């Protein structure tokens, strides 16, 4: 390796967030973290370790966005760390990640294809 640029996890911004995150025929799993939220500070590495796993995938594309630095109406985050799975839908459909929030746990939710059971609200 002489000099590379690509990264493990894509970096979504409030400028082209929906442009990249929300992609048809593509399962993009975004992660709304906080530069202050302690719990998030621990997800930084775990999220980077998972992104590299699906960095060269076909439909699975990991991405991270700073909800504290970027605000979008397409998604309202009132807590962190907050994860949201974007199914391969032309629309701005979003799914709530109710897993274990673990490197290995993520693979389970993804590998499945964003299949979560209807929980009570």
From Swiss-Prot:
UniProt domain Thioredoxin: residue ranges: 8-115
Keywords annotated in UniProt: Acetylation, Cell membrane, Chaperone, Craniosynostosis, Disease variant, Disulfide bond, Endoplasmic reticulum, Isomerase, Membrane, Osteogenesis imperfecta, Phosphoprotein, Redox-active center, Repeat, Signal
Disulfide bonds: 37-40
Protein localization: Endoplasmic reticulum; Endoplasmic reticulum lumen; Melanosome; Cell membrane
Record-marked site positions (Lowers pKa of C-terminal Cys of second active site): 101
Changes after translation: It also promotes interaction with ERN1.
Enzyme active site: 37 (nucleophile), 40 (nucleophile)
An annotated Gene Ontology molecular function: protein disulfide isomerase activity
Disease: Cole-Carpenter syndrome 1: A form of Cole-Carpenter syndrome, a disorder characterized by features of osteogenesis imperfecta such as bone deformities and severe bone fragility with frequent fractures, in association with craniosynostosis, ocular proptosis, hydrocephalus, growth failure and distinctive facial features. Craniofacial findings include marked frontal bossing, midface hypoplasia, and micrognathia. Despite the craniosynostosis and hydrocephalus, intellectual development is normal. CLCRP1 inheritance is autosomal dominant.
Family per similarity comment: Belongs to the protein disulfide isomerase family.
Subunit details: Heterodimer; heterodimerizes with the protein microsomal triglyceride transfer MTTP. Homodimer. Monomers and homotetramers may also occur. Interacts with P4HA2, forming a heterotetramer consisting of 2 alpha subunits (P4HA2) and 2 beta (P4HB), where P4HB plays the role of a structural subunit; this tetramer catalyzes the formation of 4-hydroxyproline in collagen. Also constitutes the structural subunit of the microsomal triacylglycerol transfer protein MTTP in mammalian cells. Stabilizes both enzymes and retain them in the ER without contributing to the catalytic activity. Binds UBQLN1.
Annotated protein name in UniProt: Protein disulfide-isomerase
Organism of origin: Homo sapiens
Lineage: Eukaryota, Metazoa, Chordata, Craniata, Vertebrata
Residues of the full protein shown: 368 to 475 of 508
